[PDB]
Amino acid sequence: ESGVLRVGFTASAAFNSVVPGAIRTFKRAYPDVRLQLEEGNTTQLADELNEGSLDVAFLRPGFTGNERFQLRLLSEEPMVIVLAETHPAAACKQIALSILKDEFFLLFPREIGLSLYDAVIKACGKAGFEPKIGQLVPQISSVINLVSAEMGVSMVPDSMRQVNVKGVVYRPVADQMPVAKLALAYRRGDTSPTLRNFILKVT
Amino acid sequence: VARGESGVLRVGFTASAAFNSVVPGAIRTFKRAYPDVRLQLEEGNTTQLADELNEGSLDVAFLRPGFTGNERFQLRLLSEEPMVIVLAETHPAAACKQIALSILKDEFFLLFPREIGLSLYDAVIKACGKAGFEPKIGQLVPQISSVINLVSAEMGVSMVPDSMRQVNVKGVVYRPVADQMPVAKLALAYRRGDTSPTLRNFILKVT
Ligand SMILES: O=C(O)CCc1ccccc1
Numbered sequence A: 001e002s003g004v005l006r007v008g009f010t011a012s013a014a015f016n017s018v019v020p021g022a023i024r025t026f027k028r029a030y031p032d033v034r035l036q037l038e039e040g041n042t043t044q045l046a047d048e049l050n051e052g053s054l055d056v057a058f059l060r061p062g063f064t065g066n067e068r069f070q071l072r073l074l075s076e077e078p079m080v081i082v083l084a085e086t087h088p089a090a091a092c093k094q095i096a097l098s099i100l101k102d103e104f105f106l107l108f109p110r111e112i113g114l115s116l117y118d119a120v121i122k123a124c125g126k127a128g129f130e131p132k133i134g135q136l137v138p139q140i141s142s143v144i145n146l147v148s149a150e151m152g153v154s155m156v157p158d159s160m161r162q163v164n165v166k167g168v169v170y171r172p173v174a175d176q177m178p179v180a181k182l183a184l185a186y187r188r189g190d191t192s193p194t195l196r197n198f199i200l201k202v203t
Numbered sequence B: 001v002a003r004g005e006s007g008v009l010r011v012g013f014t015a016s017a018a019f020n021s022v023v024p025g026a027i028r029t030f031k032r033a034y035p036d037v038r039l040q041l042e043e044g045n046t047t048q049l050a051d052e053l054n055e056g057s058l059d060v061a062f063l064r065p066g067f068t069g070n071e072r073f074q075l076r077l078l079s080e081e082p083m084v085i086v087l088a089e090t091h092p093a094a095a096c097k098q099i100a101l102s103i104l105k106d107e108f109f110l111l112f113p114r115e116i117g118l119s120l121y122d123a124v125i126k127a128c129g130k131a132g133f134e135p136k137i138g139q140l141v142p143q144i145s146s147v148i149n150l151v152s153a154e155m156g157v158s159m160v161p162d163s164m165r166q167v168n169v170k171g172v173v174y175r176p177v178a179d180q181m182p183v184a185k186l187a188l189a190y191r192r193g194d195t196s197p198t199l200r201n202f203i204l205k206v207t
């Protein structure tokens, strides 16, 4: 219809084409709706849904509260490896996650950064080891730039390939099939026509 | 032994600054040539990084000059860099190789909170200010990366450093500004009189 709609997403989720593609499709079909967009991590985006300062969110499932919200599983992209071009393993078409047992891992801060981190370590432990914590920077951008500086490595969703930083390469892992999970989140009982049309343009 | 071969150096940099090739390049060079120093890297906006320099929780920073209180620190001006226009592929102005800023006087602009960004925000307003308008503030997001993803959603336009060409997001292109010459300055800030050897060797690898 027409009105306001507060849409949230994680910075890493925004690269996933389904996030700007849904905002594009909704902006075109309902150009009178006042869109108000927000960026934030999974837990903070959930607190806004609870309090009411947000209507729908592109977040990662598994957070503590997925029962009291309506969760629409969206897509599953694979997790690739960020490698410095100077690294000798960059020549490999596919990397065994086992090969990076002796490298530092630049990941999200262990605290509010609860998304993806837990997915890296779970896929990483399956290769039979636990990554030593390298540098902890709260943004994917700086994670990828810090790999360019030869400060370590990391695992990122395949949608991170759009960050074409000179000096880094993106290679999938052949040992396993790690994936990044995304979900559409909104409260269980919402009657907003402006919101309703959004889940319909997403799905 | 205490000649900078070993020890701890804390380096700071802003989000946008990291994309510039000087920041990563300097770090690897220092790392390569001084493996045994514990590098403690961290991100922050220029205001936060400078305060960390003054308070002693940070040894050197890659920040943007001009911030208030910068005369208290030693600033080595790094290489300047032009500011390009970001816009969706579907934008009709994307067909041009160079864009005039007066073209987008009513176009919604996708900027960032002035608190998270002082200089780049100032450069944007000052550029459009010379173009003869104040930018229609559309949405505000915290990381720059996110304005490029939001510009992919046709939610407006924005102006970012030329380093962000590396953000090759499907649906956005970058075209330089033709009617003016916006720029994005970068400096290396440290304490005037910090004689930490590890710090001094680091300045050598930057300049
Ligand atoms: O580099 C940035 O991320 C924005 C530039 C900036 C940020 C904060 C203060 C001055 C300049």
Ligand SMILES: [Cl-]
Pocket (backbone or CB within 6 Å): B074
């Ligand atoms: Cl000096």
Ligand SMILES: [Cl-]
Pocket (backbone or CB within 6 Å): none
């Ligand atoms: Cl001086």
